[PDB]
Design a protein around this ligand. Sequence first.
Ligand SMILES: [Ca+2]
Ligand SMILES: [Ca+2]
Ligand SMILES: [Ca+2]
Ligand SMILES: [Ca+2]
Lengths: 157, 160
Amino acid sequence: MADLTHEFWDRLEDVRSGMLGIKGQGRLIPMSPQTDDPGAIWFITAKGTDLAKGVAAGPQPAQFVVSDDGEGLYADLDGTLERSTDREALDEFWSFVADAWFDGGQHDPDVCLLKFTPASGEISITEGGGARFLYEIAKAHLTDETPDMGEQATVTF
Amino acid sequence: GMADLTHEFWDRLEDVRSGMLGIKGQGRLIPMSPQTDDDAPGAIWFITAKGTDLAKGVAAGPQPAQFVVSDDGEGLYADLDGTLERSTDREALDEFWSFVADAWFDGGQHDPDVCLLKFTPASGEISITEGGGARFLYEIAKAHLTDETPDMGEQATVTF
Ligand SMILES: [Ca+2]
Ligand SMILES: [Ca+2]
Ligand SMILES: [Ca+2]
Ligand SMILES: [Ca+2]
């Protein structure tokens, strides 16, 4: 549904890490997703890496996987990864953590802004916190019904 | 070392509450609860329903599978290739059974819908880091203060 897509973007904003990769090329690796305003997931990386070199010629079909317990967001997304030369996006998603890795600032020659546009994906969202979890377990013994911790669906972006 | 990074994977995987599991060439990865013990490493165990796609997918026999992990609290990130299969091991079923499993399956561990799945990793690209707590904040702050890149941790492609 539309609410599941809006909830995905809302919770993705606080997700510190995710597993990114180009389809048919190696395995997935940990990356720091950046989002603000929705539409795409943005990443800062080195030009010498396999992901940077893989999207040098053009946009490639890619995969991005999220599994965050803190936010309760679980997603396997199919999409498109590409190198972005956008100055505004680069400046927006630059941070104090990024400066530690790249000593030359946001305009460092080794810096590479990747843009992941999701196409579709299977998403699970954990509605409620520990309070609902505690209630659903108590309810499970009272009713013999399986706990409903949230929504689950396959979405087209 | 390769063996040292492998030992540390099993060491931290116990505290990982969730992971993304799936059979290769069949749908997308879905969230599952990995149950392991670092005293007996080698396999990652999952308790699921017989009516699910993962259960039905491995009913005929063992199938190539993928298990992806990404945990900031433990600093364990891994994309693993392996084999998923049905297990009729009552010892493993009883060891990894929990209060959460009682909620989903009203008839205990000997419930008709209960299905124990065993994922044996073959290989994978694993990253081990200092986490995202006190040490991570210090390491980023120290990187700025010394003109050195942060010493996050180790990364390698491992064969189990
Ligand atoms: Ca669109
Ligand atoms: Ca341990
Ligand atoms: Ca232990
Ligand atoms: Ca510096």
